[PDB]
Amino acid sequence: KKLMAQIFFGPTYYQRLRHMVDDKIHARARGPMQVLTRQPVEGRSRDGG
Amino acid sequence: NEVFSRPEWMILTCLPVPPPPVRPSISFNESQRGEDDLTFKLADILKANISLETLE
DNA sequence: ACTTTTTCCGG
RNA sequence: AGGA
DNA sequence: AAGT
């Protein structure tokens, strides 16, 4: 069924950006700790808190 | 305060040596030290304290 | 004469 | 060096 | 950008 509205439809040059979810996503639930502070390590890479 | 903070105690006579948990030896691999800055600085104190002691 | 803060999160 |  |  036809839309009651008419859509602004045409090509538009879109760019893909360097930020992609699966490179951003992170979870931790007990992991590596600092030596000094004995606290969770920093950064997704390092499986940080 | 006579019990916890007499003025004479602001002048250091006997320096407390903090234990390793405070100045960890970041011992990368087997045969390689990696001692903390506080360890180096305490060494410099000792080094200077010995020269003075012998000197006098 | 003289000091100290300023939003939150790969190398 | 970079995101919100 | 302020204030001992």
UniProtKB/Swiss-Prot annotation, chain A:
Superkingdom of origin: Eukaryota
Subcellular location(s) per record:
Nucleus
Role noted for this protein? DNA-dependent RNA polymerase catalyzes the transcription of DNA into RNA using the four ribonucleoside triphosphates as substrates. Second largest component of RNA polymerases II which synthesizes mRNA precursors and many functional non-coding RNAs. Proposed to contribute to the polymerase catalytic activity and forms the polymerase active center together with the largest subunit. Pol II is the central component of the basal RNA polymerase II transcription machinery.
Q: How does it assemble?
A: Component of the RNA polymerase II (Pol II) complex consisting of 12 subunits.
What does the further note read?
A: The binding of ribonucleoside triphosphate to the RNA polymerase II transcribing complex probably involves a two-step mechanism. The initial binding seems to occur at the entry (E) site and involves a magnesium ion coordinated by three conserved aspartate residues of the two largest RNA Pol II subunits. Present with 18700 molecules/cell in log phase SD medium.
**Family statement:** Belongs to the RNA polymerase beta chain family.
Protein's recorded name: DNA-directed RNA polymerase II subunit RPB2
**Species of provenance:** Saccharomyces cerevisiae (strain ATCC 204508 / S288c) (Baker's yeast)
This chain is encoded by the gene named RPB2
Residues included from the entire protein: 1079 to 1127 of 1224
Curated annotation (Swiss-Prot), chain B:
Q: Name the coiled-coil region(s).
A: none
Reproduce the UniProt comment on modification after translation.
Answer: The tandem 7 residues repeats in the C-terminal domain (CTD) can be highly phosphorylated. The phosphorylation activates Pol II. Phosphorylation occurs mainly at residues 'Ser-2' and 'Ser-5' of the heptapeptide repeat. The phosphorylated form of Pol II appears to carry, on average, one phosphate per repeat. The phosphorylation state is believed to result from the balanced action of site-specific CTD kinases and phosphatases, and a 'CTD code' that specifies the position of Pol II within the transcription cycle has been proposed.
Region: Lid loop; residue ranges are 24-36
Other known facts: Mutagenesis experiments demonstrate that the minimum viable CTD contains eight consensus Y-S-P-T-S-P-[A-S-N-G] heptapeptide repeats. Identical and simultaneous substitutions in a number of consecutive repeats are lethal: 'Ser-2' -> 'Ala-2' (14 repeats), 'Ser-5' -> 'Ala-5' (15 repeats), '2-Ser-Pro-Thr-Ser-5'-> '2-Ala-Pro-Thr-Ala-5' (10 repeats), 'Ser-2'-> 'Glu-2' (15 repeats), 'Ser-5' -> 'Glu-5' (12 repeats), '2-Ser-Pro-3' -> '2-Pro-Ser-3' (15 repeats) and 'Tyr-1' -> 'Phe-1' (12 repeats). The binding of ribonucleoside triphosphate to the RNA polymerase II transcribing complex probably involves a two-step mechanism. The initial binding seems to occur at the entry (E) site and involves a magnesium ion temporarily coordinated by three conserved aspartate residues of the two largest RNA Pol II subunits. The ribonucleoside triphosphate is transferred by a rotation to the nucleotide addition (A) site for pairing with the template DNA. The catalytic A site involves three conserved aspartate residues of the RNA Pol II largest subunit which permanently coordinate a second magnesium ion.
Subunit structure and binding partners: Component of the RNA polymerase II (Pol II) complex consisting of 12 subunits. Interacts with DEF1; the interaction is direct and serves to bridge RPB1 to the Elongin complex in a DNA-damaged dependent manner. Interacts with the Elongin subunit ELA1. Interacts with the Elongin subunit ELC1. Interacts with ASK10. Interacts with ESS1. Interacts with RTT103. Interacts with SHE2.
Q: Under which name does UniProt file this protein?
A: DNA-directed RNA polymerase II subunit RPB1
Q: Give the species this sequence originates from.
A: Saccharomyces cerevisiae (strain ATCC 204508 / S288c)
Task: Tell which residues of the whole protein are contained here.
Answer: 225 to 280 of 1733
